Design a protein around this ligand. Structure first.
Ligand code: NAP
Ligand code: Q12
Length: 157
């Protein structure tokens, strides 16, 4: 299975200055729950933003840099390499990866951040004409999680 995993706001903002624009611990818990024991494929900028591979899953980085050889990270140099990866593969970002993969993935796990942030990177437009809502679950708000959010699982029709 090839899936997208993304958090985007009401206007599809995903990033600002190589970070996520919002602080939302519950979204990280969601990422942990979904991708632990599986595979993340991410662009080089996303990797450098996190600085180290996420524990307890295979971290795969897509880059043209042939000098890229980082401990605990597997490197790939082509989109085509993604299709050779075993098991459940999550396309993890950033903008460039999402743009390249949205027409290719089986499904998408989207955290809709129900606010409007300043962004410099975006998830590409998509329409519910193409995507069945397998589930939609409102995130719980508390002291540590103060921005409304909804977890969507969309499956290509
Ligand atoms: N909200 C979210 O769900 C989410 C998730 C992840 C990231 N983000 C955000 O997204 C933003 C970064 O996105 P971005 O588009 O600027 O960068 P990115 O997608 O993380 O990485 C771009 C880099 O990936 C490599 N790459 C992509 N396609 C390639 C290909 N076909 N062949 C070889 N290399 C390829 C290139 O690396 P080289 O230049 O080294 O060749 C390229 O410069 C940040 O703000 C980050 O915080 C948001
Ligand atoms: C505060 O640190 C972090 C903040 C945000 C993220 C982060 C959250 C994410 N959330 C979702 N739904 N999807 C992604 N593809 C995603 C990617 C990253 C990189 C990851 C972080 O650390 C690994």
């Amino acid at each position: 299975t090839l899936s997208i995993l993304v958090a985007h706001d009401l206007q599809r903002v995903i990033g600002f200055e190589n970070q996520l624009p919002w602080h939302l611990p519950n979204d990280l818990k969601h990422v942990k729950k979904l991708s632990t024991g599986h595979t993340l494929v991410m662009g080089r900028k996303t990797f450098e933003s996190i600085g180290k591979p996420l524990p307890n899953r295979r971290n795969v980085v897509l880059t043209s840099d042939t000098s890229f050889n980082v401990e605990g990270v597997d490197v790939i140099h082509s989109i085509e390499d993604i299709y050779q990866l075993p098991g459940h593969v999550f396309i993890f970002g950033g903008q460039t990866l999402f743009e390249e993969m949205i027409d290719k993935v089986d499904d998408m796990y989207i955290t809709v951040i129900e606010g409007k942030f300043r962004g410099d990177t975006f998830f590409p437009p998509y329409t519910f004409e193409d995507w069945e809502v397998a589930s939609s679950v409102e995130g719980k708000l508390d002291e540590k999680n103060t921005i409304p959010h909804t977890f969507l699982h969309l499956i290509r029709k």
